[PDB]
Amino acid sequence: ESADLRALAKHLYDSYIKSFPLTKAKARAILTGKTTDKSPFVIYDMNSLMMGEDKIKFKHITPLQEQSKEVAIRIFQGCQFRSVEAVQEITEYAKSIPGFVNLDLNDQVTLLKYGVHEIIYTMLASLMNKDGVLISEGQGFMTREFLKSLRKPFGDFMEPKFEFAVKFNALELDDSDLAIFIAVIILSGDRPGLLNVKPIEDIQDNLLQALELQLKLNHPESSQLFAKLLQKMTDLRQIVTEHVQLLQVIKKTETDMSLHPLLQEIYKDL
Amino acid sequence: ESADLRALAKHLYDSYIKSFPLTKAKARAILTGKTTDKSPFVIYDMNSLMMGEDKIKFKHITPLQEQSKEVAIRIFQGCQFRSVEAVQEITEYAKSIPGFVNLDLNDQVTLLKYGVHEIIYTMLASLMNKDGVLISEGQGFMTREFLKSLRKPFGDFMEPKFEFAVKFNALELDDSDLAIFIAVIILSGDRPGLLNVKPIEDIQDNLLQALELQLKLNHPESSQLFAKLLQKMTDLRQIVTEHVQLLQVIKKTETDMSLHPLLQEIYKDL
């Protein structure tokens, strides 16, 4: 019954909004979109970063570039802190999806563990455009040009995403679309370790139906959109694979240090 | 109109039969040991592989292996024969896809370059069951167990495809289904290098409509099969990749060998 799907879509959309601070609507208005009433603090150079990290609401480190920690490492470490926040926001949204909390606790952990990266890159695209990504609750903007002028290892760290984001955003999806999509991702069924796949695919199936209806009604002239969105899941997978790679590579730069114990402890890998 | 779509499905199914000698239909008939009009010779060890050259058209070596192109090599030399055989075939099927031959000559080469291996592992699935795969046009059956006990590297060339096959075959798709799915794979548009994307996406958007109707009609009691099928394309991409990196391994540990030109031309790391 379409009566239930429309209902399921509104529920999830509602949770998505109350779960994620920066929405794509809120992000798009700030971005390319005009809507100028509080412009962001651009970061196009080493000086932009420095001459700004001391005036931007950031809770980790301040501008100190001169034989005192490097810029390429400070930015990466910075994205890990934030991704720990996102993981928490995603976990909360996961518990709003009908059926998720009723699943075996182990599988819930497995679904989150293996779906968090795909969700993050999907939402990252809401903050990015061909020229950069919004930063800090949408208070800054780190240009795409800067990010590529980063150290030898971090130079390819964000370029692939930018390429994915541009294609993904061409779909012109809104938060009500992304909400259902993000749920489909969480409720996969192919994640390794699942103890009871039936309920998971049962829910994904119901989420997939909602998503389909949501796209037909919300984008009536955008043919086969549903199909395009699902085939984007192939792109995210590579994005996640390719990500664990550069990670292992980075895991061969900074390592043995006695001050990282309880700090590294908080930032395992995901 | 859903009538042109049905006509497209029929058209495609028709060219599919005309380009592929061993359909899933014939393959399943041979695999269901019940149908004994012509059963296969089961390869599951050296003696079997050895005797396999008597009841099959195995032009390879029957006697000693190691000091004369070991068993492993022999098996993959043939494998290589099949891919090129499949490429030429898939290449023939592609020309039947409406509009494909009208695309930019270069894009045609790109659609095939990235499409053909995803298609080969899709169709290869029709020849597998949890236990093994039919070889030499169904005349033979090589055990999954035997294939996995080969030399350190060659040993794990097929396992990831058997795992794909087991879950992909659970979808119970038939030749008329795969025909349209196989066409959706080629007419991607997200393939690297494509000079002209719009025209390509107009064809695929057409192929996806067809496939959607085909699945609803041919598998009415199968919810979200369409979606399930499209997500399977993510598995395909991954399989292609692990494969190439394996090929790169042999390329270094076997300098006396050779990866066929056509396959070499198609393959590019990264």
Ligand SMILES: O=C(O)[C@H](Cc1ccccc1)Oc1ccc(-c2ccccc2)cc1
């Ligand atoms: O990569 C390819 O194009 C094919 C794809 C394929 C794999 C399994 C069944 C049918 C096709 O798989 C090959 C794997 C190994 C080899 C090979 C050839 C000579 C020596 C060592 C490996 C050739 C093809």
